[PDB]
Amino acid sequence: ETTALVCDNGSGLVKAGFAGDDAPRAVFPSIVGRPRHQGVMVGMGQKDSYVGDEAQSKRGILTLKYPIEHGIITNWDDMEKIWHHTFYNELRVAPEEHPTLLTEAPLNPKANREKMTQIMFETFNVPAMYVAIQAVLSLYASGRTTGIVLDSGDGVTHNVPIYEGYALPHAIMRLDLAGRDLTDYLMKILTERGYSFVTTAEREIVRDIKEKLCYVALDFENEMATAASSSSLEKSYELPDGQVITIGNERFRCPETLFQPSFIGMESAGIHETTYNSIMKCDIDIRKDLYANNVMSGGTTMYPGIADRMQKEITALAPSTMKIKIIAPPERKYSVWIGGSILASLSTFQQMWITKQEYDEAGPSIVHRKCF
Amino acid sequence: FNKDQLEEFKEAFELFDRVGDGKILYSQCGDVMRALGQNPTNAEVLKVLGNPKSDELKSRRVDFETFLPMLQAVAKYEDYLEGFRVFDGNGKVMGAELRHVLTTLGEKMTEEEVETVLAGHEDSNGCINYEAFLKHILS
Amino acid sequence: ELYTKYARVWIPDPEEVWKSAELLKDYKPKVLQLRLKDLEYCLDPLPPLRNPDILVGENDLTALSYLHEPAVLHNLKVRFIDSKLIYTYCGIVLVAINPYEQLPIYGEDIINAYSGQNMGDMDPHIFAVAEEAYKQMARDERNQSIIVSGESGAGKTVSAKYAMRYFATVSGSANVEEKVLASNPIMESIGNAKTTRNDNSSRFGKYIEIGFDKRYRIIGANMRTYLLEKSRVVFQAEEERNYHIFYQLCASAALPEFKTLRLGNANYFHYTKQGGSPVIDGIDDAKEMVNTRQACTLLGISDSYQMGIFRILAGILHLGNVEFASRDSDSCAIPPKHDPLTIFCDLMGVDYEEMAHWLCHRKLATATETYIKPISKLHAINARDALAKHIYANLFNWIVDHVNKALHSTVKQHSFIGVLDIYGFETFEINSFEQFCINYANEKLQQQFNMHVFKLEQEEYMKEQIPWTLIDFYDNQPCINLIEAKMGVLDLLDEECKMPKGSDDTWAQKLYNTHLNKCALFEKPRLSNKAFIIKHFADKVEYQCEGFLEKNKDTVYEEQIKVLKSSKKFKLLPELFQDSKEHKKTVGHQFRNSLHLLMETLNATTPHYVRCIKPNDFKFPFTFDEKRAVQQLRACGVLETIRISAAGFPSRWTYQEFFSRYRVLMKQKDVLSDRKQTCKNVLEKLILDKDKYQFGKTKIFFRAGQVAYLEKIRADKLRAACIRIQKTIRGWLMRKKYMRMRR
Amino acid sequence: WXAXCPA
Ligand SMILES: Nc1ncnc2c1ncn2[C@@H]1O[C@H](COP(=O)(O)OP(=O)(O)O)[C@@H](O)[C@H]1O
Ligand SMILES: Nc1ncnc2c1ncn2[C@@H]1O[C@H](COP(=O)(O)OP(=O)(O)O)[C@@H](O)[C@H]1O
Ligand SMILES: [Mg+2]
Ligand SMILES: [Mg+2]
């Protein structure tokens, strides 16, 4: 036998497991910590860096970098550290035995593929490798072959329409509004209620607020008036030290920035109007089958109400006769991984892999030509 | 054949005339040839007879003068011994096997014909001394 | 060349595949003519030649001097019809032809006569191969397998039973048969099914070990099963039933116990309904379980467990009737109440709300978390039918374990002898995943047969110190690889079961894309995308892609099985499961695995072989149809064996028997008075070239024609000597009779 | 990135 490895280099969470599994065997944040403070106790064990879940525990004493920003890998040594931790510590597998499948956003700089491949063959000596678009995997994950895939992570949002397995590249739209730049806005709006969050390890505390408390307003202005009218929306949270904090109409105001990028100060339209303006680029024949098969993917899609706000507000754009349908399975955060576990297990896929000999012959230019 | 031979043969032929017309049947021709020392097969007899049909073989009658050329034509030990040694190497031949082959192979004979030729020559085991029996049947 | 006036040849005919002619004028190099009552026989870029009678009666198909389909078929037919003998030998392989009437021959004096003798000395009988096994196992420690094979009617179970009667009778006392034979009413009930071309058909692969004491006596028996056709439990073709036990059970329902199980009529249940054939003429299913339960009791399956088994089968029957309604394109539900689910849950003692929930949803968890998906109506129906198939398979493996418990004994077995009953290669004029599996298994079994026969002939050559290079065989590994290998037919089917939307149309189109021109052995039918053709060793066979996938698929959700394994109402249902990734595996991969385990079971033994041919479709006693028998003899590789043995040296003769037959040809001067050298001296006179005949330590090896030639010259010499003897005797007898009577 | 954005 052999089993492929499946790895997804999200901006925020690494997800990894063996192909053919239905759930990732490791998840940990793609976070690298270095000691912040002068080390006093001689005889303490001083690890030069902490990676992943370790850095969660010790965050109070660390500066936490993320090596991925807006789906560009920004400094490659720490990325290598993350993959080293992943294969040796999380999966406990030698990559030299096991082929590996990797995942990327659709438009990100072309150099990124060359370098990511080079590291796999030169550093880890993987038997074979591949790179897949997230929006492609989400269709395998949702069990359908015609889709417009709306996928939003920590670092990137992107739309890709697929019809009968033909991707449609001109159709494709990308925004840099994502979980991270929700979090940063959440700091600035929490400051309105007189709470201050200045530091990276503390930013994670903000992120945990955003994950627990936030939700999407089904009418933004009507609930804003309702929250001005009454306490009833306002709700209570705990810091790590046990200070309780209470959070009002503002907790929806971050998910609202998805639908109004003007708040953060983006140029663009929000996710629904770019989804529509993507479909409008498509050939009129297909559009009826895109409007049914909306698939939402990636963890930023997880807020309650975002399905119903998406369906309502896109219905305002689309002509009345075509029924809009939106499909938001409760596990979609994984779904890019689940669909990569599906893809890496196909017998037809086995011919696709970029192999060691063929890479040595070509050099990393091959990753553009063969892989897509 | 000389005149004396022709006279002896004619006398013998007349002894074989069972109808009184001074003739024998075609079917008796073989018997007459055998009585005069020839040993033709029934097939050879029919061949020298001209492959006669059943009717003339049983009822057409010929005098000595027409019979004679056929007798002449027919007239003009180690194989016999080996032939008997086929059915043997102690100098014997089963009586049962000779009876079976003579009544079931070749120009098959009746069990009574075989008993007649075999009468007094087989012992209690049913074995025939074939050199003595052969000399006897060749005499 | 030889063809003369009053020779014989075989000519083809639609109505009987070969019929005989005499030759009307000698052949010279064009068209021939024949007598039967004449037509010129067309020749195209020769006819066969027909053996002399003296061979054709005989016991061994290698003894025939011309080897070809007409001679073999005619020999088997004269043996069956005229001689009233069924057993015959071909190469090493015994062949058996169903007499469908019962014969004294199995009496115990026959058994004693066979005991301690060989293949050649005694007339072919099923006992003779058992004696071969019993002798082999005393030559060598090696365990012996006996393999019985043929289309469903042919007689395989009954032939196994006689092989067991033989071993037990020769063994002396130590009492296995009573138990083993009493098991069969159980096994036939759970494991046999009714199919379009006959009424009782074993849909699994069935194995017995007889164990022996260090000094040979039967100590006990142990039973195994392989290749169970799980799909039949939920999906049935036209006019074809699932396993008899469901019908026996339904026809029982008026009995007092089964009322508790609330069994409807036999057609009522969705798994019985599908065949549209709820009754077999002449078999009163309601009576047959009285035998089945008698056999269980006689075997010691407790009166409690019998009711547990029937409770579980009722469980599956009720389960199958249970039908979802789509809430949505994305999800379904069981309706606000669905009656038969209640009956399922109260048979097996589980909360209706728990089965209702877990049937409708599935659970998926990364261990920090857990998530529940609603699932499509289709995937819910696939899950239900996989839970049905998984229960049935586990029940069958339990019934076979409790059977085996009664059959073992604890004293260490020295060596087993093993007897195998499996379906033979089979072609039906609609073909489906069940036949694809059955043919693939008959590939594996015949590869093993071919390689074994090739080995035995290499042995026999070296045992007679003769050159070897001629030895040849048919290699079916390139056809097996088409079914088995990666991007094979099975592997693309299992792929498409994954692929997010997958259909018997896209699977076929994938087959054509990858395979279509890349092998000879795969072919498309001219007028359909939906079907494809595989050139198996017996035949080109054509399969329909429709409904492979729905048969292909098992996935047994951990939640539903957990819920069953929870229940406390009765012992057996938790007992089945107690013993994973295997829940994921499709039926085809489980089948491949079980077949590998079967080939691991049969390899590291030495086979002996039986073939069983069904003489006629219509159950007519002790009569025969050439048109079927040819189709059987091709599917059994008998024709392949015979052809390949004819291409080389077919015929074996001991110098002792050669001299014993052909001293008639000898001359006493030519008798050197030791047989081997005498015949080595004689033979060169009679046959031109040593390429056409050979000499070994004990055996002469002829090429095919030469036996008939020798028999002819023997006849000629016999006639010549007889005519000489008769002519001389007639001459002096005639003299004696007319002269002595006239005297 | 390299231009229009910080990465
Ligand atoms: N229950 C939740 N509600 C809202 N957001 C969530 C929830 N759980 C996780 N998230 C957000 O999901 C984002 C990570 O999404 P993910 O798809 O895993 O990114 P990537 O796959 O690119 O690593 C983070 O911003 C995290 O805060
Ligand atoms: N050698 C035989 N002697 C007598 N009857 C036989 C013989 N072989 C088959 N039969 C009859 O034909 C039937 C069909 O054969 P059977 O062994 O029952 O089928 P299967 O091949 O499914 O085991 C037997 O039950 C028996 O009635
Ligand atoms: Mg992602
Ligand atoms: Mg049977």
- In this structure, what token pair is assigned to residue B123? 């012992």
Spell out which residues of chain C touch residue A353, defining contact as CB-CB under 8 Å: none
Q: Phi, psi at residue A89, to the nearest 5°?
A: -85, -50
Q: Domain check: are B93 and B106 in the same one? A: yes
Q: Domain check: are A289 and A314 in the same one? A: yes
The answer to whether C157 is a known catalytic residue is yes
Q: Which domain holds residue A36?
A: 29-69
> Which residues, other chains included, contact C527 with Cβ-Cβ below 8 Å and sequence gap of 6+?
none
Is residue D4 within 8 angstroms of chain A, CB to CB?
Answer: no
d(CA A166, CA A169): 9
d(CA C297, CA C286): 18
With a 6 Å cutoff on the Cβ, whether A340 touches ligand 1 is: no
Instruction: Say if residues A187 and A203 touch (Cβ distance below 8 Å).
Output: yes
Q: Domain check: are B42 and B56 in the same one? A: yes
* Annotated catalytic residue, options C198, C200, C267, C277: C198
Q: Domain check: are B52 and B98 in the same one? A: no
Helices within C433-503 (DSSP H only):
433-463, 477-484, 489-498
Q: Domain check: are B26 and B85 in the same one? A: no
For ligand 1, mutation pick of A73, A103, A154 (most atoms within 8 Å of CB): A154
Residue A259's CATH number: 3.90.640.10
The answer to whether C202 is a known catalytic residue is yes
The answer to whether C424 is a known catalytic residue is yes
Q: Which residue has the tokens 């990676």?
A: A51
d(CA A17, CA C499): 20
Instruction: Say if residues A154 and A11 touch (Cβ distance below 8 Å).
Output: yes
Q: How many CB atoms lie within 10 A of CB C580?
A: 8
Instruction: Say if residues C400 and C184 touch (Cβ distance below 8 Å).
Output: no
With a 6 Å cutoff on the Cβ, whether A255 touches ligand 1 is: no
Residues bordering ligand 4, an ion, CB closer than 5 Å? C 157, 202
Instruction: Say if residues C456 and C609 touch (Cβ distance below 8 Å).
Output: no
The answer to whether C201 is a known catalytic residue is yes
C-alpha distances in Å from residue C33, one per residue of A135, C51, C69: 77, 19, 22
Residue A167's CATH number: 3.30.420.40
> Could you give the number of structural domains in chain A?
4
Instruction: Say if residues C726 and B107 touch (Cβ distance below 8 Å).
Output: yes
The minimum-distance atom of ligand 1 relative to the CA of A13 is: 23
Of the candidates A25, A143, A325, the beta carbon closest to that of C500 is on A143
Three-state SS at B68: helix
b/e burial code for range C362-382 (CB count within 10 A of at least 16 → b): bebebeeeebeebbbbebbbb
The angle formed by the CA atoms of residues C492, C493 and C494, to the nearest 5 degrees, is 90
d(CA C420, CA C208): 7
CA of C149 from ligand 2 middle (Å) equals: 12
C-alpha distances in Å from residue C724, one per residue of A199, B103, C10, C411, C630: 129, 14, 35, 73, 47
H-run or E-run covering A101: strand A100-104
Maximum Cα–Cα distance for chain D, whole Å? 9
Contacts 24+ apart (CB under 8 A), A310-316: A310/A150, A310/A271, A310/A272, A310/A275, A312/A218, A313/A259, A313/A272, A314/A272, A314/A275, A314/A276
The angle formed by the CA atoms of residues C615, C618 and C623, to the nearest 5 degrees, is 40
Q: Using CB atoms within 10 Å of the CB of residue A339, give its burial: 0 to 12 exposed, 13 to 18 middle, 19+ buried.
A: buried
Contacts with D, A 144-203, CB within 8 Å: 176
The residue count of chain A comes to 372
The answer to whether C178 is a known catalytic residue is no
Q: Of A80, A32, A36, nearest to A52 (Cα)?
A: A32
Three-state SS at C166: helix
> To the nearest whole angstrom, how far is the Cα of D7 from the nearest Cα of chain A?
6
Q: Domain check: are B69 and B89 in the same one? A: no
Binding residue ranges of C for ATP: 150-157
Q: Of A332, A324, A275, nearest to A300 (Cα)?
A: A332
- In this structure, what token pair is assigned to residue A300? 């930023």
Q: Do C498 and A342 touch (CB under 8 A)?
A: yes
Three-state SS at A116: helix
- In this structure, what token pair is assigned to residue C99? 């007499």
The experimental technique behind this entry is cryo-EM
With a 6 Å cutoff on the Cβ, whether A339 touches ligand 1 is: no
What's the reported resolution, in angstroms, to a tenth?
3.5
With a 6 Å cutoff on the Cβ, whether A302 touches ligand 1 is: yes
With a 6 Å cutoff on the Cβ, whether A161 touches ligand 1 is: no
> To the nearest whole angstrom, how far is the Cα of C333 from the nearest Cα of chain A?
17
Three-state SS at C102: coil
Q: Which domain holds residue C455?
A: 447-552
C421, β-bridge pairs: C148, C206
d(CA B124, CA B110): 22
Q: Domain check: are A279 and A166 in the same one? A: yes
Q: Domain check: are B117 and B95 in the same one? A: yes
Q: Domain check: are B69 and B85 in the same one? A: no
Q: Which domain holds residue B105?
A: 78-137
In the listed set B31, B51, B77, which residue is the last one of a domain according to the structure?
B77
Q: Domain check: are B92 and B52 in the same one? A: no
C-alpha distances in Å from residue C547, one per residue of B75, C230, C552: 91, 15, 8
Nearest-Cα residue of chain B relative to residue C726 = B102
> Could you give the number of structural domains in chain B?
2
For ligand 2, mutation pick of C95, C98, C192, C199 (most atoms within 8 Å of CB): C98
State the best of A291, A332, A348 to mutate against chain C, taking most chain C CBs within 10 Å.
A348
For ligand 2, mutation pick of C100, C204, C613, C614 (most atoms within 8 Å of CB): C100
With a 6 Å cutoff on the Cβ, whether A10 touches ligand 1 is: yes
Instruction: Provide the Cα torsion C86, C447, C542, C388; round to 10°.
Output: 90
The answer to whether C580 is a known catalytic residue is no
CA of C421 from ligand 4 middle (Å) equals: 8
Q: How many CB atoms lie within 10 A of CB C608?
A: 23
C-alpha distances in Å from residue C125, one per residue of C84, C85, C118, C129: 13, 9, 11, 7
How many C-alpha atoms does A301 have within 13 Å on its Cβ side?
29
User: How many CB contacts within 8 angstroms connect chain A with chain D?
Assistant: 13
Q: Which residue, by CA, sits nearest to atom 9 of ligand 2?
A: C155
d(CA C198, CA C14): 25
Q: Phi, psi at residue A13, to the nearest 5°?
A: -120, 125
C-alpha distances in Å from residue A220, one per residue of A90, A188, A255: 43, 19, 10
Do A and C make contact via 3 or more CB pairs under 8 A? The reply is: yes
Q: Which residue has the tokens 């069981």?
A: C334
Nearest-Cα residue of chain B relative to residue C671 = B89
Q: Do C364 and A27 touch (CB under 8 A)?
A: no
Residue C477's CATH number: 1.20.58.530
Instruction: Say if residues A227 and A249 touch (Cβ distance below 8 Å).
Output: yes
Instruction: Say if residues C367 and A27 touch (Cβ distance below 8 Å).
Output: no
d(CA A254, CA A260): 10
Q: Which residue, by CA, sits nearest to atom 10 of ligand 2?
A: C100
Q: How many CB atoms lie within 10 A of CB C217?
A: 15
Q: Of A145, A209, A152, nearest to A332 (Cα)?
A: A152
Three-state SS at A192: helix
Chain C: residues touching B (Cβ < 8 Å): 664, 667-668, 717-739, 742
Q: Domain check: are A155 and A276 in the same one? A: yes
How many C-alpha atoms does C8 have within 13 Å on its Cβ side?
13
